[PDB]
Ligand binder design. Structure first.
Ligand code: HEM
Ligand SMILES: CC(C)c1ccc(C(=O)O)cc1
Ligand SMILES: [Cl-]
Length: 393
């Protein structure tokens, strides 16, 4: 009753161009079986949203990668928030929601905005840049480690470690096994930086440790939550900002609209998150048989959610393949949905908003003037290199 497909969503051909295969996945039915990896797949908005919003049945505590923690050893101790179910999830979630809350945003906004304005001014001084290395990477590297209160030495481990983490959500293909078998120095750095004495007061990390006396988390849990922020807080925004620049380069009319009204910057970033979905896919594991779109899924089965496909599903979105910075984007699943919905989403939106605002106010044109090169990751979508020429306003 469930169609079986041989599409490999973790192959280089898929990463190079996933949209045709994503349509095939959506149009085959509400639930498919992926013979390549023996998992169920859901690619339509309705089913992705339903799965995300039933975390008891489609749980996270058995891993959100292909591996089932009840069958295999986790490559690292499980995340206490990403890879936990309620009620164990609830208190760490509350701590991270309070660390990365509105008030903390007000405390970091001026530095983030100044850094974004300064970056755009510098890049306009460069004229010809790599929008990845020189912008999408450089800006978050210039503000997020400070906001975490990391020392200067070793911050070079953050992006490699993140790539590993996201590769490790994939199947045991070359990307995953490559990341995990040689990984140890990055793990050593991250774990060391998670300890209270190495995290400067006033930063996100030290605030996590500071919540360890409120009764929400214990001292032994705080390092692992800092590890969550060091895993998730940099690379996702790098590919999101890269996505937004790529969209504005490919849709010059939308750049002109954004320049004319820079207050669209936040929505312009949000629509980029919808349009490219930096985080493409995540798994759940069924804790019971669950009829989903008329299809039966067994106990203990992995279910692959195609977030990007849900964000391009024509059943839900008008002109899904257009980048529209005045689109009503609310309801997209690029940040997830439900109890695990991105707890860092305000940081991501702040970085994206202030950077797109800086471009809107300072840049007249973004023209691609070189080969665009894609970065391959089992979970992340984004570019390796995006050479552009920036014309000043
Ligand atoms: C463009 C930027 C970002 C994107 C697209 C993104 C995407 C996502 C998605 C799809 C989820 C849901 C995972 C799931 O349901 O299993 C998630 C959760 C999470 N994100 Fe982000 N994220 C971004 C930025 C950030 C930042 C900047 C931080 C921290 C500083 C962060 C930290 C987290 C954490 C800790 C979770 C787990 C929350 C939970 O399990 O309750 N993310 N993110
Ligand atoms: C959703 C993604 C950005 C993410 C990755 C790792 C963790 C963690 O280590 O807790 C959380 C979220
Ligand atoms: Cl680790």
């Amino acid at each position: 009753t469930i169609p079986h497909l041989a599409i490999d969503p973790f192959s280089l051909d898929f990463f190079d161009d996933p949209y045709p295969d994503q349509q095939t996945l959506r149009d085959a039915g509400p639930v498919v079986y992926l013979d390549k990896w023996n998992v169920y797949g859901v690619a339509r908005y309705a089913e992705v949203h339903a799965v995300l919003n039933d975390p008891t049945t489609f749980c996270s505590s058995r891993g959100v990668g292909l591996s089932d923690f009840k069958k295999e050893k986790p490559w690292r101790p499980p995340s206490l928030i990403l890879e936990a179910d309620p009620p164990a999830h609830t208190r760490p979630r509350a701590v991270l929601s309070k660390v990365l809350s509105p008030a903390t945003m007000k405390t970091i906004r001026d530095g983030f905005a100044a850094a974004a304005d300064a970056k755009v001014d510098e890049l306009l001084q460069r004229g010809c840049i790599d929008a990845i290395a020189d912008l999408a990477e450089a800006y978050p590297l210039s503000v997020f480690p400070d906001a975490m209160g990391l020392k200067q030495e070793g911050r070079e481990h953050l992006l490699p470690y993140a790539g590993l983490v996201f590769n490790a959500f994939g199947p045991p293909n070359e990307l995953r096994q490559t990341a995990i078998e040689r990984s140890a120095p990055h793990q050593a750095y991250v774990n060391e930086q998670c300890q209270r004495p190495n995290l400067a007061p006033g930063g996100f990390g030290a605030c996590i440790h500071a919540f360890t006396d409120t009764g929400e988390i214990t001292p032994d849990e705080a390092p692992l939550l800092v590890r969550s922020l060091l895993s998730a807080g940099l690379d996702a925004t790098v590919n999101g900002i890269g996505a937004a620049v790529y969209c504005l380069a490919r849709f010059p009319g939308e750049l002109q609209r954004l320049r004319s009204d820079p207050t669209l910057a936040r929505n312009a970033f949000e629509e980029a998150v919808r349009f490219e979905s930096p985080v493409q896919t995540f798994f759940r594991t069924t804790t019971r048989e669950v009829e989903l779109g008329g299809a039966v899924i067994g106990e203990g089965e992995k279910v692959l959610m195609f977030l990007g496909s849900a964000n391009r599903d024509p059943r839900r979105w008008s002109d899904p393949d257009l980048y529209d910075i005045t689109r009503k984007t609310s309801g997209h699943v690029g940040f997830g949905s439900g109890v695990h919905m991105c707890v860092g989403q305000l940081v991501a939106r702040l970085e994206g908003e202030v950077m797109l605002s800086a471009l809107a106010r300072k840049v007249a044109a973004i023209d691609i003037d070189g080969p665009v090169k894609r970065r391959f990751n089992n979970t992340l979508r984004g570019l390796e290199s995006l050479p552009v020429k920036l014309t000043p306003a």
